[PDB]
Design a protein around this nucleic acid. Structure first.
Length: 850
RNA sequence: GGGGGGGGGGGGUUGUUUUUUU
């Protein structure tokens, strides 16, 4: 029975356990290096209100009222519902400090309210004292709104005109006074560093606050606690008419206004309606978290019988049978295929937009669709929409189609907010959306496919019915629809707060706990304590929650604190360019994209790009180097390279701009003596992959994994100190790699979807962990003489070598604190750079293999 | 635990939501 198997398994595990203490690396330096270290240790140890401007603005407004383009634009704008409330909106804003505006889809509140305020100020003779700033949650949204408003005003965007925008690394600044600026929310937070009061800003508008991102909440709290200091500033908040009362309550019951929307009628169908209408018969016959989740999940199964008999009277028996056999935790793509076939058979012309949770669902639905004979012809176009697919499909989705053909788009929630087709008539909404929750207890981030929210369902329904009446099919029964969450949980309760805590400390917003508690929907105390503990362990904050000199640079850097530490270390060790590229990739996406079908080829090309570095961080460096090399040969070679390795040119350009920004910040802080990341003086060690790996280890140290090379096949098992047994994601370049020189990996992203996965990994060498890791100890197990880092990263070494390494590590810690405290480029002429030079030499030369 | 048996089927399994920073 199980006894024999358990007895065999215990012995096998013991044999594997006994084999662990036979496979440790042998940290070993030669006699000459040890003598040099001994000598070095022994030696070293011993605005305003201008009237003429307002007059000119009024004269321009009067003279330009007769322009033909402006007349046409106002004829277009007249159709907007928000024009009917212009007098009410202006009076409400002018008579109260804070107002809340609720508008449905098509109300145009984004492009009209700011124009209303600016024009009203201009024609009253005080147009030189208006400075309106409207915040947007997306860069493309800000750009589009800015250009739309500028066109409505018959003026060019920016260029000294009234309207403009400013996003990261792109800005078209408008006039100093009497202007509208459509920036992202993150721009305003950067303003508070040097202008805490926003003295030049008279009106500030917070847009799309119904969806609760971190930056919007932080800015809202800052504005709330700043109003007492500025009695003349006016605040406008825009919501989506759902739970718009809570924002008014948060601001002391400020007046609230509502703009009716203007959308074509949309017919809504549920699962039972689809089953009854399309007569869907299942083909396969093989049908055989905490807190709020438990409740909803429970009431569902406390009424499940009671709800069911209500379908046995109005509807048919087949519908009830199919509903009964229906199962959650998945999206029935057979039902989607049957519904699509029904629509293409006897429904009128119109694009179909299907909302799916993940990429696997998109792939299997696309395969199911094109497996049939009818969809493989030229009378149907199927476009999958996903942020990881090449832009050639994003630019091919807006084009109108001939009336004979039909366009079917299978999309994630990107098409719900970012992509606006403005052509879809039929919408099929699988009620699944992927959400991420941060488990502070296990310090882990988890993804799962949860039921879509009420606001998300309303937005999906409103996606159709833009240019003509449309249909919305919902893949969940009425009981699920009525038992659905009103809003998605804000990311303030779903993300780590380390960067947020550093930003709070850099804005002089008082204590971290106090400011976080003053937030609406405040985070739990456990998350705040964990963030502060991580920051103090990182040595970014001292004991008394104050900004350590390293913490100042970390906070002023627009990245995560670990990424900022990596950037500082790269600037200090003169490997600036690869470290900056890796940091940009870690902060904002990887340049690799994947097209549908050709997915294995993508992984083959990715492994080709990684050469033999056994790391997915250096493959990004290789891809960036190849992309830069292709430019010097021409644009055609650039396109060919991006099409060969499945890269994203836009992402690569963005990464280049982020690298330039980091270099500019480092020059400002004084770490480097140049602004170009490619300056050789700051890129002495840029060609050494070992130094780059050491700097990566220095940046994200505590994220370390252990490899145990077993034998049957020669599989690899990866262990983590806190997460237990984990796995390497198939997207990684080390998922099928077995020739590992060292048994330690470094990772940045670790997420739990079905099993704990390390999305990016990098094989790292013992001296990197020795000189850039935790505490060092020198013990002796039985016979073996060992040196260990953090009591679990153990290496083999004699006592003398280990003690010299420990003393060298202490000396480098002191030197690093000195260098960070008073930044200055390191001069490599035998003065005090010997401490860093010897570790560079050790990492370069001493380590060869295991 | 293995491919010591077919004494059981007690253990052998699992790919990428969307965004943001003078």
């Amino acid at each position: 029975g199980r006894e024999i198997g358990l007895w065999y398994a215990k012995k096998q595990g013991q044999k594997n356990k006994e084999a662990e203490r036979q496979e440790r690396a042998v940290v070993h330096m030669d006699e000459r290096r040890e003598e040099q270290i001994v000598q070095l240790l022994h030696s070293v140890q011993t605005n305003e209100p201008d009237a003429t401007l307002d007059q000119q603005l009024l004269e321009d407004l009067q003279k330009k009222k007769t322009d033909l383009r402006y007349i046409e634009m106002q004829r277009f704008r007249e159709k907007l519902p928000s024009y009917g409330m212009q007098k009410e909106l202006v009076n409400m804003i002018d008579n109260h400090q804070v107002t809340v505006i609720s508008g449905e889809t098509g109300c145009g509140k984004t492009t009209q309210v700011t124009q209303f305020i600016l024009d009203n100020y201009i024609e009253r003779g005080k147009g030189s004292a208006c400075r309106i700033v409207c915040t947007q949650p997306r860069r493309i949204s800000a750009i589009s709104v800015a250009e739309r408003v500028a066109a409505e005003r018959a003026e060019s965007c920016g260029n000294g005109n009234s309207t403009g925008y400013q996003i990261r690394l792109q800005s078209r600044l408008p006039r100093k006074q009497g202007s509208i600026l459509y920036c992202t929310t993150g721009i305003i937070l950067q303003w508070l560093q040097s202008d805490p009061h926003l003295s030049s800003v008279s009106h500030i508008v917070l847009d799309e606050i119904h969806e609760r991102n971190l930056q919007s909440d932080v800015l809202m709290t800052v504005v709330k606690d700043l109003l007492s200091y500025r009695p003349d500033l006016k605040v406008v908040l825009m919501s989506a008419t759902l739970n718009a009362e809570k924002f008014s309550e948060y601001f002391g019951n400020c007046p609230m206004i509502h703009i009716p929307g203007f959308t074509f009628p949309v017919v809504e169908y549920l699962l039972e309606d689809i089953i009854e209408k399309i007569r869907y018969v299942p083909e396969q016959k093989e049908h055989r978290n905490r807190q709020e989740k438990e409740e909803k999940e429970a009431i569902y199964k406390e009424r499940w019988p009671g709800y069911l008999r209500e379908l046995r009277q109005r509807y048919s028996a087949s519908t009830v049978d199919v509903v009964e056999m229906m199962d959650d935790e998945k999206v029935d793509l057979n039902l989607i295929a049957a519904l699509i076939r029904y629509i293409v058979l006897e429904e009128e012309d119109g694009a179909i937009l299907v909302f799916l949770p993940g990429w696997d669902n998109i792939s299997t639905l696309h395969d199911l669709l094109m497996s049939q004979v009818m969809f493989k012809s030229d009378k149907f176009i199927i476009i999958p929409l996903h942020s990881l697919m090449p832009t050639v499909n994003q630019t091919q989705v807006f084009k109108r189609t001939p009336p004979g053909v039909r366009k079917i788009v299978i999309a994630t929630n990107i098409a719900e907010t970012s992509i606006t087709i403005d052509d879809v008539v039929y919408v099929i909404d699988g009620g699944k959306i992927k959400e991420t929750h941060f488990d502070t207890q296990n310090n882990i981030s988890t993804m799962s496919a949860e039921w879509v929210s009420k606001a998300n369902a309303k937005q999906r329904k409103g996606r159709a019915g833009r240019v003509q009446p449309g249909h919305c099919y919902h893949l969940y029964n009425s009981l699920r629809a009525s038992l659905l969450d009103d809003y998605q949980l804000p990311e303030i309760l779903r993300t780590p707060l380390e960067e947020l805590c550093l930003q709070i400390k850099i804005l002089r917003l008082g204590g971290i706990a106090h400011f976080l508690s003053r937030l609406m929907d405040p985070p739990s105390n456990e998350a705040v304590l964990l963030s502060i503990k991580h920051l103090m362990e990182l040595n970014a904050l001292d004991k008394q929650e104050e900004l350590t000199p390293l913490g100042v640079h970390l906070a002023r850097l627009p990245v995560e604190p670990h990424i900022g530490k990596m950037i500082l270390f790269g600037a200090l060790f003169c490997c600036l360019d690869p470290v900056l590229t890796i940091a940009a990739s870690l902060s904002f996406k990887d340049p690799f994209v994947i097209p549908l079908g050709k997915e294995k080829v993508a992984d083959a090309r990715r492994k080709e790009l990684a050469k033999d570095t056994k790391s997915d961080h250096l493959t990004v460096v290789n891809a960036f180097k190849g992309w830069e090399k292709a430019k010097q040969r021409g644009f055609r070679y650039e396109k060919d390279y991006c099409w060969e390795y499945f890269l994203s040119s836009n992402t690569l350009q963005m990464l280049h701009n982020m690298k330039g920004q980091f270099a500019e910040h480092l020059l400002g802080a004084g770490f480097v003596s140049s602004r170009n990341p490619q300056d050789p003086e700051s890129n002495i060690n840029s060609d050494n992959e070992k130094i780059i790996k050491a700097v990566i280890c220095a940046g994200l140290y505590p994220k370390v994994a252990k490899i145990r090379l077993n034998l049957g096949r020669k599989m690899v098992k990866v262990y983590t100190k806190t997460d237990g047994v984990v796995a390497i994601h198939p997207k990684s370049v080390n998922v099928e790699q077995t020739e590992f020189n060292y048994n330690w990996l470094i990772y940045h992203l670790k997420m739990r979807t079905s099993s704990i996965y390390l999305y990016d990994c990098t094989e790292v060498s013992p001296y990197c962990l020795l000189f850039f890791g935790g505490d060092i100890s020198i013990q002796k197990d039985n016979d073996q003489e060992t040196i260990a880092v953090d009591e679990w990263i153990i290496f083999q070494s004699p006592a003398r070598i280990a003690h010299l390494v420990k003393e060298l590590r202490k000396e480098l810690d002191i030197l690093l604190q000195e260098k960070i405290e008073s930044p200055h480029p390191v001069d490599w002429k035998d003065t005090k750079s010997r401490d860093c030079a010897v570790l560079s030499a050790i990492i370069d030369l001493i380590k060869t293999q295991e």
